[PDB]
């Protein structure tokens, strides 16, 4: 008598599913030895190179000059890198990226990251280059939590908690990827939808005109009304709340969702408006929904938030 419950992680692109699966791996699963950490040192380097290439291209598109001219050269050096071929991280590329990150010109471009595509945790790495550039850098566990690796396929992870075994199914959150989702819609005990609170002022990678949060919203509203989940529980993680905390100061919610008329520059007011868009006034779903504000990079926040959700699920079984 060892029960096995199947949990799906769903969500739009880059909402934080695979970041959650790592937290599950740290809390309950096997965790990261030094040999496991080392596996990502490559991936950290590739993220920095991908970051600055995408920022350089923006400088052209958005037509922003490089304050200092000697950084025009540096930009050319890096832009010609093949990022898939990155294994080490040495000069002149180190100082190239530093000298750039210091450039008042390209710092203007970072502030306008909203208009183009620049993955989150870009600033986490570039502010900490010297630690990463070092000739003996072992990645820290947060470095492994920040790392961005686009996910494709349908990867089932098992987890041995005391009472039960969870089989947590990770998936891709791009538009193409949802045509695969039907091949994990059997015997589902619960869904765990991830919405990225930061993406109210952002457009999708796969569609340039459409707003990420209109997608994440509509996707959730549709999916909970599907016949497969007629007897499945729906946990809604609103992730990336720390990013909101920073962004809501400058990017005003009223400008992208006109229904909002709570105060400006308020983190709390903004997040609780969103919550209502997802759950409230849905005629096709009258099941209860269990929300949760989260920060998948923040480990303590996840141990608390999930060691609750464990109960909520088992309790219904």
């Amino acid at each position: 008598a060892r029960r096995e419950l199947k949990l799906l992680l769903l969500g739009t692109g880059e909402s934080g599913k695979s970041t959650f699966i790592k937290q599950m791996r740290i809390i309950h699963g096997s965790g990261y030895s030094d040999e496991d950490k080392r596996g990502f040192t490559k991936l950290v380097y590739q993220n920095i190179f991908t970051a600055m290439q995408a920022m350089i291209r923006a400088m052209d598109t958005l037509k922003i000059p490089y304050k200092y001219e000697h950084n025009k050269a540096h930009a050319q050096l890096v832009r010609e890198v093949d990022v898939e071929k990155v294994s080490a991280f040495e000069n002149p590329y180190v100082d190239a990226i530093k000298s750039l990150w210091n450039d008042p010109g390209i710092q203007e471009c970072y502030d306008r990251r909203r208009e183009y595509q620049l993955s989150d945790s870009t600033k986490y790495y570039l502010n900490d280059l010297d630690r990463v550039a070092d000739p003996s850098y072992l990645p820290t566990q947060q470095d492994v939590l920040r790392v961005r690796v686009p996910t494709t396929g349908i990867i089932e992870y098992p987890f041995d908690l005391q009472s039960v075994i969870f089989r947590m199914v990770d998936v891709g959150g791009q538009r193409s990827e949802r045509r695969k989702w039907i091949h994990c819609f059997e015997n589902v005990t619960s869904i765990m939808f991830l919405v990225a609170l930061s993406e109210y002022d952002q457009v999708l990678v796969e569609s340039d005109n459409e707003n990420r949060m209109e997608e994440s919203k509509a996707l959730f509203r549709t999916i909970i009304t599907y016949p497969w989940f007629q007897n499945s529980s729906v946990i809604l993680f609103l992730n990336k709340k720390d990013l909101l905390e920073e962004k809501i100061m400058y990017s005003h919610l009223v400008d992208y969702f006109p229904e909002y008329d709570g105060p400006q520059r308020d983190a709390q007011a903004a997040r609780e408006f969103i919550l209502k868009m997802f759950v409230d006034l849905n005629p096709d779903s009258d099941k209860i929904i269990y929300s949760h504000f989260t920060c998948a990079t923040d480990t303590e926040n996840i141990r608390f938030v999930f060691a609750a959700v464990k109960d909520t699920i088992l309790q219904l079984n």
Partner: peptide, 13 residues
């Protein structure tokens, strides 16, 4: 069902 997941914005609209 499948086609609403790929483009939900159009389905809900």
């Amino acid at each position: 069902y499948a086609e609403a997941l790929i483009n939900p914005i159009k389905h809900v609209s």
